[model samples]
Target: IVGGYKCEKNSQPWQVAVINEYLCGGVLIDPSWVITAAHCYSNNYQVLLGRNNLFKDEPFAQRRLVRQSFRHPDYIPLPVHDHSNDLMLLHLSEPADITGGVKVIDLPTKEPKVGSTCLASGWGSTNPSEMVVSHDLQCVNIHLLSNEKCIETYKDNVTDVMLCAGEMEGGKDTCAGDSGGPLICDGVLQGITSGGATPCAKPKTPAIYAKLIKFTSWIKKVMKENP
Candidate 1:
């Protein structure tokens, strides 16, 4: 997370480090299910749960291989910049032990209102220039922007399934390596880090997230079918 601080240990239990060719963040919504950005999906993915620092062999950390992955049908592969339906679910090879510093987060039941504050957490780069991923989990507050402002900034790229949030003047924002991370608002998982501007944290260039409330039906359907 760019311009964010280290998170309190075990505070973000639902956070997961998804390792592919590169790293991305994920959210544990069930003992065996994880939600992440579809763009992060690859053939073989591993998930690390309950860890704040990447360098440490934290006892609370649990590593699991992905058993199956279900990306949104409408999501096209990377080479395309379309993030309108950037979501995916990973079924773990085995259910994570939901104890110690590992647990599940509830999805939001309603849409997030504009002008509200939401907490976005990840192990992404703190410095966009360096593009180095943080060893420790970091978090920052993002101010949700109005649809009018979002559409104005992103044009047709801003869809109903997406949300825009950032500082009007910029400074704090999510950068690379934070994709698929959680955006918590009112104690519910409201959004997923989808994409953002290049060299993130610039003025007037808010980050985009997959609006969770807009995908609950699809999420449930996938879970039910896969189960």
Candidate 2:
């Protein structure tokens, strides 16, 4: 019983935390692998899984240090900020304990259509009027925007490796500390939260994301070699 824009209870099994601080959200693709944004790249950042309320100390929670992290060779950032190929995978020290709400989620082989409803969850800012980052996970429903429109908004900065999703009228979107989170469309993992404009502060500002479908081949290649 929550509003469409209200805070969703922590329930997504595939959602994971980066550095325990939940600085970023990660998608559990395999027992020992997690997919996140390359921009969220860090050295030895701890990864955690299977917790609903991070503040409440859920007994089922699991934590693992990153054994290895692979970033897309072509991932471009900083001087360019083009957000192309902005994907990364973290290899855990050991396989995540797959019990309770901790499990792997499926990836989308094909891109979702424009205007499709997608869910982006994370321990991000919850209040529109304030910059209150929530400890309890929250999810907001956002509709996909056409790449053409996204390009128009971002000009030449938008690339094929990236996708866009956000509300045209302001209010629903991921902001600070929400990067690298998964954007779920119809139960399939589609994109990782690469970057977005300030939430609730912009009207019709579509945020950029690392498109997962476009990197399937690269992902498989890396996983095979790493595993």
Candidate 3:
């Protein structure tokens, strides 16, 4: 393992699978609420929490049925996450088990500092155009870049609600099945992996994420109304 080493099972306690097999990813913000990108929003799907190895049966896999899917009203897709507003909250049918290392991740009160190192994990494709996904959950270390630089890099396609993270000369980045995964720094939820330049990783094309801080208010409201 180099750069972003393969993490141990259940290393990210808050990480969860987005009901669609091992594709989309999500973060458990509360016992009954999981936050992810709007692009991965789906009420038809349930979530699996406390699971690490998605391809096989893991004893820690706690299934949570989703009661509701809350997507940001302003969410609009733009050529694969190229638009504004990308956030969603899944209301679990019941509270998740808050024990056995299945815990909730803390939300960030302020924006993550630029150039900060954040960890991203998912069971997504290892490379573009690949049919087979990884067996164990995969994780990578990404460097958060300034919004200004990201906007400039994407030719003004980036938005304030979005964040960029990766080296200018990209070697590793989030891919197809990694959407809605958490980007954490210091164990605090920062962003959700949205999408990025095709072909997996490319030079000067950093992975884009939806800044989780932008939707904290909505998340709280949903929790209140649901209860």
The best candidate by lDDT is: 1
Error of 3 at 49 (Å): 1.1
Worst 10 residues of 3 by lDDT: 149-158
> What is candidate 3's CA lDDT for residue 126?
74
Any idea what lDDT model 2 has? 0.75
TM-score of each: 0.94, 0.88, 0.88
Between candidates 1 and 3, which one is better according to lDDT? 1
**What tens digits encode model 3's per-residue C-alpha lDDT throughout 177-222?**
7788888876568998874324766677676788778878877887
Task: Tell me the deviation in Å of residue 17 in model 3.
Answer: 0.6
lDDT by residue (11-103, candidate 1, tens digit) is 999999999986889999999899999978889998999999987989899999999999888787765558778899999999999987999
Full-model lDDT for every candidate: 0.86, 0.75, 0.75
Q: Which stretches of candidate 3 lie over 4 Å from their true place?
A: 1-4, 77-81, 129-131, 151-158
Assess candidate 3 and give its lDDT.
0.75
Q: Show model 1 residue runs off by greater than 4 Å.
A: 151-158
User: Model 1 RMSD to the real structure?
Assistant: 1.8
The numbered model that scores best in TM-score is 1
Pairs that clash in candidate 3: none
> For every candidate structure, what is the RMSD over all alpha carbons to the true structure, in angstroms?
1.8, 2.9, 2.8
